[PDB]
RNA sequence: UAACCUGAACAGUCUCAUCGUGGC
């Protein structure tokens, strides 16, 4: 048994639904019911004499994907109707392209560093943010600082995001009255 | 660009020219290149003179 | 009394030696022309 | 990619072809005996004739080199150039070189093998073409100047990357460097394939088995604190344990015993894996030192076994196989040793398998559990299946005297098991 | 090539996991814990002081916290929402030790005994107004007991009837332990050790059906340990010496019924297997009382040295497989040492565990659940997934 | 061990190890046999504590021989493990010299323990 | 948030059944809604991860059916303190809802399956599943 | 008189003029002395021959004052042999390390 | 009666050490 790629697709959406080798090629395309299509490639062997017994494990290559759950919120990122921000119940914020579907990219949730230098809390096993109730994007100062302000399900602070970097921001705005965020806005 | 090829008169050295600017003189049968110069105007052709030591 | 049986089962457990990073680093010095059964009991002395 | 990268690839392909005098000198001065200024002036006839002398010496020491005198050391091979024949002739002579190297891996302490493989280094360029097999064959000799010499002249493979600060150095690689070399996974797959060819062609020698087992148990020791690396590592070293147990050498069998005992005490393996491991241990047990190591190995592998199901009766096939390899006198004697091994859970499983599968040898289980002391759950399960033995078959003096032993010690416990199932007056009326 | 001694190869080619699965383990794996963090137990209602003592209920899901702000709070704990059951503020009486007592006869009393640096000790009778009584009479022995701080509650049998009653045990000045009734407050007996009494613990051992025996185990500062049989008159049965150990702060037993893992039913009383003597340098000797009740200079099975300042808590988990060393002197000084292997778990606590300055610790009797109270006034709560 | 003269009883060894612990907190002791003999040579030791627990005791019983030349008090305690705990290191300590000081906070405790030592000489 | 995880009245609103956590294990208790007509004993779920997903009062030995998260419907009498009968499906899927009409119990599964049980016969009568209904709760 | 000297003195015992010039001006003292010609220090190489000159002087102080101060001594080399085993495996564990990165 | 020691008893207005720089 060469290798096992575990959790290559979600079991709840069907597992790996079709996997096929492109023939003559060391690349295999998988697709699952979680709205995802991946490719995995076999690199050539690392031993220069044996080869057939030292099989390097398959690594990841390109993939396309979308939301695995129906989206819960929708906004347009700019006045040109090129990108649109889209948040789903599977707790991901995607930025989908209306012009060319290769440009669709998941906004990353990799947090910044704390401003003073203290530790940030949270679980070690990183999971995605609670699913997005509302959002408000105003790209007047885009690239300059935080640009999207978003409000999640049953939590008392609103995160920010940067659409230029396509990532989370440094700030989570609290409500200061122990109430969940019911709306967000931002000025132009 | 498209590469004009040229060999030395004994087959030891190879001289390639890109159409864009990339001229490389090399020992194609070892792995030794001895000139890789990017002359950013459109080059057309090259040749060795009497050696791998000079090329036009 | 299944809790009492479970407590006597976890009570009849004896202290063992665990493998460290460096429980076997000092064997290369004396793997020279000794026999393999002497190596086996030299390992078993480390494990016990 | 870039042009200098693609040209480095074509240099690495054309590494061995001498395309002028300076490359021929730099490429022919790589000797294993002489220094560069002598080695560059030597011929093929000179190094061939004294390598043929050394192969005659090596062949009268060990007579399996005569066919290498027929093919690899013949006089057609003076003019045989390596990089002028096709891939099929290349793979023919490269498994010829692999055969010579894993035959002469054992002989590396005596100078005829140095002067003989000098000709493989200088004619067939095996320091740069067949280099992985050369390193893997002489890996044992790493404190020695012959491994210093092959490291000085070698071109190092990408799997052997940590030896790159010990090439052209005056000090030998250290043991921690050897464990860092073995700690990779692709290197572990490479070395286990090398051992598979060794075990297949019957060339495993005891210095190699010692070095291999030392580096393996140090890999397990280094990875003893990350379970995902141990779990990546289990079907490699247990596979090589199966392939060492599936051979005839007592030395390689107890090498596999060492690997199995360290690996089972490093992580708690599955019960069925431990049982199949003891089946593979017993299925080829022929020696005596192998029997000593096999009994100690099966005892520790059953000791390192937790949960509901540690001390069941081991099944009928494996129990009668363990009987055919180890009878009663062997088990009783080994328990009577004053060094006191820890044989608790295995001896409990053994006596319960006797009570389910033999039903004649109960005086011996009285004597052996008189010898060694057990725990409360062990003797509780023993007396429960003795109670079931009394209720299935008629209760004679051997079962009666067993219950006299279980009355003479810990009578409250046998009362507790009878009250959990049965009655004391009813059991005394039974027997 | 082929169509379809190989037992190991076949079992490896079929298996994919290679370790014990979930519940066919029944005893803890060493060196790697499995411990999730729950909601902080006193997060619902904050504490106004360092949390000086902490005890779970023997049966109910209740956690009693208490500290120098002279109030004691009971929390219904669960995973999500640890709420506050009730809360009683004793004015002018800062509390230092607070214990759920639950008798063995009817298991229906549910007293809370609490005490601080005072010449009295309160006893709240749990009734879900609040009826509390005050013990303030040492019946002739007030000179040798000037502060009710260090008490422990235990069970005692009459040994001519099979009638048990609770005793509280007060650690006094000279070497004295004053044992007195937990309902009437009558001074029953006293046990004097020779030196500076620093700590003590209670061991029980069964004798027959329905009879057990209570042993008080009291340690000098120097390291010498007295064991008093006190189901008879409080007379010494064993006197031994701790190997090493010069400033001795805390002794504990474990592996059976301690005062912190209490038995609900008299037939469920067990003999303790382990005994840990933790010292001022952070050294914790560990003795195995399945063989170390005979030697009279017994050697420890291991001396742990992992945390370097003064041992102020050391508690055994109810199964008796983890010991918890803890120090209130520096921050984050808590270790969980697995035993019998006597090896500290290396994956918890990490550098980011919000342990704080650990000034109390408690183990749940059923759930497998740590509560750790620090000097900021926070009980943090963890669940061990082996249980 | 028989040849470990004056050995302390429990009360004297408890107060010896108490003054060792507070001298270790005041950084006023030299722990180890070689450092004890260095303080013996330099004449800056108040008294020497040794352990009657080392398996060769002859690695110890040489600093008595230059204690009785400089008439500095010396004493034996029964446990090298407990002496190491008192000195406040993680290793067993075989001998320890409490060094001299005249502005020391624990000067009175050092003097009381050394008088109790030189009563039994 | 509330500690009471599940709760339901009997018909006529005379008793309240309620599932709360008790130090990592679920417990099911019944209280009378007026004392003028405590109840200190609970059903204890003995596993730390087995939990009640739904509950329904039956209507005459009075009982609760507790739909668990391991493909079981426990049937638990309240005057006594044991689960009297353990209905089980063939699976391990948590069950999202139950109901009953008379003696005929019906239940839905996390694999969107319908099961029918008979309280008078203690048997799984029917098992089926229907198209385009795929997230039933 | 050699037995009642500390192990640091037994380390530097031969190198008195280098020692006292390197103390009377504030320089770095020698590390070998007369003990440099021991076979173990010969086996060491680098700065760890200073290191095992130190550990060899420590174990040599142990063995030397055992020999001078024992009365039930047996002339059989037992304490010196266990001390030599300690020094040899210490020399092994600091010749096994290497300052290179592999 | 006291003195002294001692329990987690310096340190957010951060405390302390050491080497320097400029003017305690």
Swiss-Prot record, chain A:
It is found in: Nucleus, Nucleolus. WD repeats lie at residues 13-65, 72-106, 133-172. Disulfide bonds: none annotated. Signal peptide: none annotated. Involved in nucleolar processing of pre-18S ribosomal RNA and ribosome assembly. Present with 2020 molecules/cell in log phase SD medium. Interacts with snoRNA U3. Interacts with MPP10. Interacts (via WD repeats) with UTP18. Component of the ribosomal small subunit (SSU) processome composed of at least 40 protein subunits and snoRNA U3. The WD repeats are grouped into two tandem seven-bladed beta-propeller regions. This is U3 small nucleolar RNA-associated protein 21. It comes from Saccharomyces cerevisiae (strain ATCC 204508 / S288c) (Baker's yeast). The lineage of its organism: Eukaryota, Fungi, Dikarya, Ascomycota, Saccharomycotina. The chain holds residues 283 to 470 of 939 of the full protein.
UniProtKB/Swiss-Prot annotation, chain B:
WD repeats lie at residues 1-38. It is found in: Nucleus, Nucleolus. It comes from the Eukaryota. Involved in nucleolar processing of pre-18S ribosomal RNA. Interacts with snoRNA U3. Interacts with MPP10. Component of the ribosomal small subunit (SSU) processome composed of at least 40 protein subunits and snoRNA U3. Present with 5800 molecules/cell in log phase SD medium. This is U3 small nucleolar RNA-associated protein 7. It comes from Saccharomyces cerevisiae (strain ATCC 204508 / S288c). The gene is UTP7. The chain holds residues 112 to 167 of 554 of the full protein.
Curated annotation (Swiss-Prot), chain D:
The keyword Membrane does not apply. GO terms for molecular function: snoRNA binding; U3 snoRNA binding. This is U3 small nucleolar RNA-associated protein 10. It is found in: Nucleus, Nucleolus; Mitochondrion. Its main location: nucleus. It comes from the Eukaryota. Interacts with snoRNA U3. Interacts with MPP10. Component of the ribosomal small subunit (SSU) processome composed of at least 40 protein subunits and snoRNA U3. In the absence of snoRNA3, forms a complex with other t-UTPs. This complex can associate with pre-18S ribosomal RNAs. Present with 18200 molecules/cell in log phase SD medium. The modification N-acetylserine is found at residue 1. One of its GO terms (biological process) is positive regulation of transcription by RNA polymerase I. Belongs to the HEATR1/UTP10 family. The chain holds residues 2 to 432 of 1769 of the full protein. Keywords: Acetylation, Mitochondrion, Nucleus, Ribonucleoprotein, Ribosome biogenesis, rRNA processing, Transcription. Coiled coil: none annotated. Involved in nucleolar processing of pre-18S ribosomal RNA. Required for optimal pre-ribosomal RNA transcription by RNA polymerase I together with a subset of U3 proteins required for transcription (t-UTPs). Involved in ribosome biosynthesis. The keyword Acetylation applies. One of its GO terms (cellular component) is t-UTP complex.
Swiss-Prot record, chain G:
It is found in: Nucleus, Nucleolus. Interacts with snoRNA U3. Interacts with MPP10. Component of the ribosomal small subunit (SSU) processome composed of at least 40 protein subunits and snoRNA U3. In the absence of snoRNA3, forms a complex with other t-UTPs. This complex can associate with pre-18S ribosomal RNAs. It comes from the Eukaryota. This is U3 small nucleolar RNA-associated protein 5. The gene is UTP5. Involved in nucleolar processing of pre-18S ribosomal RNA. Required for optimal pre-ribosomal RNA transcription by RNA polymerase I together with a subset of U3 proteins required for transcription (t-UTPs). Belongs to the UTP5 family. Present with 33100 molecules/cell in log phase SD medium. WD repeats lie at residues 13-46, 47-86. The chain holds residues 2 to 149 of 643 of the full protein. The lineage of its organism: Eukaryota, Fungi, Dikarya, Ascomycota, Saccharomycotina.
């Amino acid at each position: 048994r060469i290798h096992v790629l575990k959790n290559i697709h979600r079991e709840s959406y069907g597992g790996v639904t079709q996997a096929t080798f492109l023939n003559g090629q060391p690349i295999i395309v998988t697709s699952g019911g979680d709205n995802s299509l991946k490719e995995y490639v076999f690199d050539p062997s690392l031993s220069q004499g044996s080869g057939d017994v030292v099989v390097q494990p398959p690594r990841y290559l390109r993939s396309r994907g979308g939301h695995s759950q129906p989206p819960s919120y929708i906004a347009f990122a700019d006045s040109q109707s090129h990108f649109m921000l889209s948040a789903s119940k599977d707790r991901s914020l995607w930025s989908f392209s209306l012009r060319k579907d290769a440009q669709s990219q998941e906004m990353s949730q990799r947090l910044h560093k704390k401003q003073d230098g203290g530790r940030v809390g949270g679980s070690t096993i990183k999971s995605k943010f609670p699913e997005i109730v509302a959002l408000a994007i105003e790209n007047a100062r885009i690239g300059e600082w935080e640009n999207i302000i978003t409000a999640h399900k049953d939590e008392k602070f609103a995160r920010t995001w940067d659409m230029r970097n396509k990532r989370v921001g440094r700030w989570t705005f609290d409500t200061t009255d122990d109430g969940f965020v019911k709306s967000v806005a931002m000025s132009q | 660009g498209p590469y004009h090829i040229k060999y030395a008169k004994n087959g030891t050295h190879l001289l390639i020219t890109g159409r864009k600017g990339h001229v490389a003189s090399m020992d194609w049968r070892k792995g030794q290149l001895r000139a890789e110069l990017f002359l950013n105007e459109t080059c057309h052709s090259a040749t060795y003179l009497q050696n791998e030591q000079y090329f036009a | 009394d299944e809790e009492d049986i479970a407590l006597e089962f976890i009570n009849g457990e004896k202290k063992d030696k665990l493998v460290n990073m460096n429980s076997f680093t000092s064997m290369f010095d004396n793997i020279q022309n000794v026999q393999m059964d002497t190596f086996f009991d030299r390992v078993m002395k480390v494990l016990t | 990619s870039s042009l200098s990268d693609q040209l480095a690839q074509v240099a690495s392909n054309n590494a061995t072809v001498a395309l002028d005098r300076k490359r021929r000198q730099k490429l022919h001065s790589a000797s294993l005996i002489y220094n560069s200024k002598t080695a560059a002036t030597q011929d093929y006839d000179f190094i061939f004739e004294n390598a043929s002398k050394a192969l005659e010496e090596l062949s009268q020491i060990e007579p399996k080199f005569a066919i290498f005198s027929r093919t690899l050391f013949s006089e057609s091979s003076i003019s045989l150039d390596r990089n002028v024949q096709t891939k099929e002739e290349i793979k023919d002579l490269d498994n010829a070189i692999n055969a010579y190297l894993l035959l002469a891996s054992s002989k590396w302490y005596l100078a005829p093998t140095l002067h003989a493989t000098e000709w493989l280094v200088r004619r067939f360029q095996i320091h740069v073409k067949n280099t992985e097999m050369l390193l893997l064959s002489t890996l044992n000799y790493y404190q020695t100047p012959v491994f210093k010499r092959i490291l000085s002249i070698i071109k190092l493979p990408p799997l052997f990357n940590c030896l790159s600060n010990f090439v052209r150095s005056e000090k030998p690689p250290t043991a921690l460097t050897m464990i860092k070399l073995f700690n990779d996974m692709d290197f572990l797959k490479l070395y286990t394939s090398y051992l598979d060819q060794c075990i297949k062609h019957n060339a495993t020698y005891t210095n190699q088995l010692l070095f291999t087992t030392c580096c393996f148990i140090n890999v397990v020791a280094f990875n003893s604190n990350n379970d995902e690396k141990l779990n990546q590592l289990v079907p490699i070293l247990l596979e090589i344990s199966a392939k060492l147990l599936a051979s005839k050498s007592k030395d390689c069998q107890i090498a596999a015993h060492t690997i199995l005992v360290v690996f089972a005490t490093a992580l708690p393996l599955k019960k069925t894996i431990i049982l199949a491991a003891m089946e593979t241990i017993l299925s080829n047990l022929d020696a005596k030192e192998a029997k000593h190591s096999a009994l100690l190995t099966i005892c520790k592998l059953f000791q390192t076994l937790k949960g509901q199901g540690n001390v069941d009766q081991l099944p009928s096939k494996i129990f009668k196989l363990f009987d055919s390899k180890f009878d009663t006198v062997s088990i009783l004697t080994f328990l009577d040793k004053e060094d006191k091994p820890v044989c608790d859970k295995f001896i409990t499983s053994y006596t319960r398998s006797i009570a389910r599968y033999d039903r004649s040898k109960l005086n011996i289980i009285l004597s052996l559990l008189k010898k060694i002391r057990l725990e409360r759950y062990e003797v509780r399960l023993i007396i429960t299946d003795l109670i079931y033995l009394s209720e299935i078959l008629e209760d004679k003096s051997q079962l009666v005297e067993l219950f006299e032993y279980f009355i003479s010690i810990n009578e409250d416990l046998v009362l507790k098991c009878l009250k959990s199932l049965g009655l004391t007056g009813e059991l005394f009326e039974i027997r | 090539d082929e169509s379809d001694i190989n037992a190991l190869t076949k079992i490896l080619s079929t298996t994919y996991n290679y370790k014990d699965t979930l519940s066919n383990s029944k005893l803890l794996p060493p060196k790697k814990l499995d411990i999730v963090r729950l909601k902080d137990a006193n997060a619902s209602h904050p504490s106004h002081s360092a949390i000086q003592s902490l005890s779970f209920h023997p049966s109910k899901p209740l956690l009693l916290t208490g500290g120098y702000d002279k109030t004691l709070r009971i929390y219904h704990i669960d995973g999500k929402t640890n709420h506050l059951v009730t809360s009683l503020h004793l004015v002018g009486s800062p509390i230092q030790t607070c214990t759920f007592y639950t008798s063995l006869s009817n298991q229906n009393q549910q007293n809370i005994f609490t005490a601080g640096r005072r010449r009295y000790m309160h006893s709240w009778d749990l009734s879900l107004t609040a009826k509390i009584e005050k013990f303030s009479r040492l019946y002739g022995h007030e000179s040798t007991q000037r502060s009710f701080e260090n008490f422990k509650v235990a069970h005692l049998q009459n040994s001519q009837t099979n009638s048990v009653h609770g005793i509280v045990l007060l650690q006094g000045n000279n070497g004295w332990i004053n044992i007195l009734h937990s309902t009437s407050g009558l001074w029953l007996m006293g046990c004097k050790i020779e030196g500076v009494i620093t700590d003590f613990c209670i061991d029980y051992q069964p004798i027959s059906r329905g009879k057990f025996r209570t042993i008080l185990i009291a340690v000098n500062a120097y390291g010498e340990v007295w064991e008093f049989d006190l189901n008879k008159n409080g007379h010494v049965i064993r006197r031994w010496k701790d190997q090493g150990g010069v400033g001795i702060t805390k002794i504990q037993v474990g592996g059976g019924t301690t005062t912190t893992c209490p038995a609900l039913q008299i037939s469920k009383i067990k003999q303790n297997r382990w005994l840990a003597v933790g010292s001022e340098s952070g050294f914790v000797n560990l003795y195995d009382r399945n063989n170390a009740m005979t030697s009279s200079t017994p050697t420890p099975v291991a001396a742990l040295d992992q945390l370097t300042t003064t041992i102020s808590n050391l508690q055994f988990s109810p199964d008796g497989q983890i010991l918890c060393m803890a120090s209130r002197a520096v921050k984050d000084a808590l270790r969980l040492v697995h035993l019998p292997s006597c090896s500290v778990f290396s994956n918890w606590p990490t550098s980011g565990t919000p342990l704080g300055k650990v000034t109390s610790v408690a183990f749940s009797p059923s759930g497998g659940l740590l509560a750790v109270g620090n000097e900021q006034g926070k009980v943090r709560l963890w669940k061990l997934n082996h249980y | 061990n028989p040849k470990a003269f004056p050995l302390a009883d429990a009360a004297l060894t408890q107060q010896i190890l108490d003054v060792v612990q507070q001298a270790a907190n005041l950084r006023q002791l030299k722990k180890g046999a070689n450092e004890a003999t260095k303080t013996l040579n330099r004449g800056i030791s108040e008294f020497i504590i040794m352990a009657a627990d080392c398996e060769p005791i002859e690695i110890l019983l040489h600093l008595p021989l230059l204690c009785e030349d400089k008439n500095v008090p010396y004493v034996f305690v029964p446990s090298r493990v407990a002496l190491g705990r008192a000195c406040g290191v993680s290793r067993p300590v075989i001998a320890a010299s409490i060094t001299t000081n005249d502005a020391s906070a624990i000067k009175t405790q050092i003097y009381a323990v050394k008088d109790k030592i030189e009563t039994l000489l | 948030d509330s500690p009471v995880l599940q709760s339901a009245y009997d018909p006529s609103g005379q008793y309240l059944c309620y599932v709360t956590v008790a130090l990592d294990k679920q417990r099911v208790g019944v209280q009378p809604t007026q004392r003028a007509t405590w109840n200190e004993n609970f059903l204890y779920l003995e596993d730390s991860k087995l939990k009640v997903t739904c509950l329904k009062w039956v209507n005459d030995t009075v009982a609760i059916i507790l739909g668990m998260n391991n493909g079981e419907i426990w049937l638990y009498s309240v005057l006594a303190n044991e689960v009297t009968y353990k209905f089980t499906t063939g699976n391990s899927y948590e069950i999202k809802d139950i109901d009953l009409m008379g003696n005929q119990l019906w239940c839905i599964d996390s694999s969107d399956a319908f099961y029918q049980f008979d309280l008078l016969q203690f048997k799984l009568l029917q098992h089926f599943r229907i198209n385009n209904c795929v997230q039933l709760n | 008189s050699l037995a009642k000297s500390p192990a640091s003195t037994i380390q530097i015992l031969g190198a008195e003029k280098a020692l006292f010039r390197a103390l009377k001006t504030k320089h770095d003292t020698p590390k070998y002395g007369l003990l440099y010609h021991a076979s173990l220090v010969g086996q060491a190489t680098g700065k760890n021959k200073g290191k095992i000159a130190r550990v060899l002087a420590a174990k040599a102080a142990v063995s030397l004052r055992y020999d001078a101060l024992a009365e039930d001594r047996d002339d059989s080399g037992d304490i010196g042999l266990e001390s030599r085993a300690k020094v040899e495996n210490r020399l092994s564990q600091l010749e096994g390390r290497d300052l290179r990165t592999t």
